[PDB]
Each structure stands twice: as structure tokens, then as C-alpha cells.
Amino acid sequence: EINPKFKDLRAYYTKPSLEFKNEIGIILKKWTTIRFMNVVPDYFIYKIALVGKDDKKYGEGVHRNVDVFVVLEENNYNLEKYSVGGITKSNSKKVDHKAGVRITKEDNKGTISHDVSEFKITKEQISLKELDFKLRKQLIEKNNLYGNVGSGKIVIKMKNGGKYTFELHKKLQENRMADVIDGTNIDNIEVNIK
């Protein structure tokens, strides 16, 4: 049932995630090829890589009203607690929003199945990192993504008419992990797997 072709992707997207909300981030002096936002929600200092749009977005010093979606990863910076992107502005109000998920899957035998879920949204502003990670994990667990088949796309359709796309044959690009969208404006999610 489990094609070893998809081993790396299935491994990555079954990693545990952590969520730190209403926190502060501290950015110190640059000391390598990239900068980090430090978050300290427990006895650890989490080093959050500033990639893509985040590098210009957050200057040296203190940033308040930060939420981070964390997936701890191994890294080349010799850091114990490291994660990439996933930084968003904390809520300014309760958010209780639901977006329908429609899943079309075609296996190696050409069998076409359809499935549905509901993606619960509790955040005003949500990172692509979080949408991409939670949705793939769910598809692995419920729809056998990266089992029999491991290609296709997730598409997040915005109420404002726009859309964002995640190709399932590759890990989400690290620069896009820092991209953020308006959670309240997600309309529906379309997933096609083959």
C-alpha cells in the first residue's frame, strides 16, 4: 500500500507540528546566511528562519502579537529548535470559520474517488506553511496521499476571487512558507490527487 517513491514526502508531512500563539519574537544581530526570529514559549528558544517576504518584513528587535506555526526540522545551522516561516499576526477577534474541502483522487489503476471534508479556520491571518502542512497530513491520514499515489495539487480558493496552489509532487517551496493570507477570506479548498 506504501510506494517507497514517496518516502521523503510522506515522512515530512507526518512530522508533528507545534503552535505558539499571542507570543513575542526577538530578532538579534545577523550571524549567518539568514536571520531568525527567536520565540520563547517554554524552556526552549525556538529559532524561526526568516525566509521569503519575512526577511524585509521583520527588522532587528522586538515584535509583539506574533503567532508561529512550527514544524521542527533538522538543519545546517547546528540549531536544536528550528523551523521555517509560519509567522503570522495574532488574532484581534474570535474567528470561527469553516471552508469545504473537495478531494478527487485517481489511483494507478485509474479508479476515480471523491471525498469531502471541512477545514476549520480559527485564525485571522494564516500562513501558507500551515495550510499546506495540515492539509497534506490530513490527506496522508484519510486519503492515502503518498501511499499508492503522490502527485496533483491543493488549491485554496479565496472569497475575493483569488487562489493559491500547492503541487503535491514536491515539498512546499521554503520562501512560500512565509507567505500569509486572510483566513477569514478562504472560501473552499480543491484537492486533486493522481
How far is 127 from 123, CA to CA, in rounded Å? 10
- How many C-alpha atoms does 127 have within 13 Å on its Cβ side? 30
The residue (of 6 and 46) whose beta carbon lies closer to Cl ion is 46
58 scored as a contact of Cl ion (CB under 5 A): no
Task: Pick one of 28, 34, 40, 62: the residue that binds Cl ion (CB under 5 A).
Answer: 28
Short-list 64, 69, 30, CA closest to 179: 69
From the list 30-38, 88-96, 103-111, 151-159, the region that binds Cl ion by CB under 5 A is: 30-38
Interface with Cl ion (CB under 5 A), residue total 2
Binding mask 110-129 for Cl ion (x = CB under 5 A): --------------------
From the list 31-39, 137-145, 160-168, 184-192, the region that binds Cl ion by CB under 5 A is: 31-39
Label residue 90 exposed, middle or buried (CB < 10 Å: 0-12, 13-18, 19+).
middle
Label residue 101 exposed, middle or buried (CB < 10 Å: 0-12, 13-18, 19+).
buried
Binding site for Cl ion (CB under 5 A): 28, 36
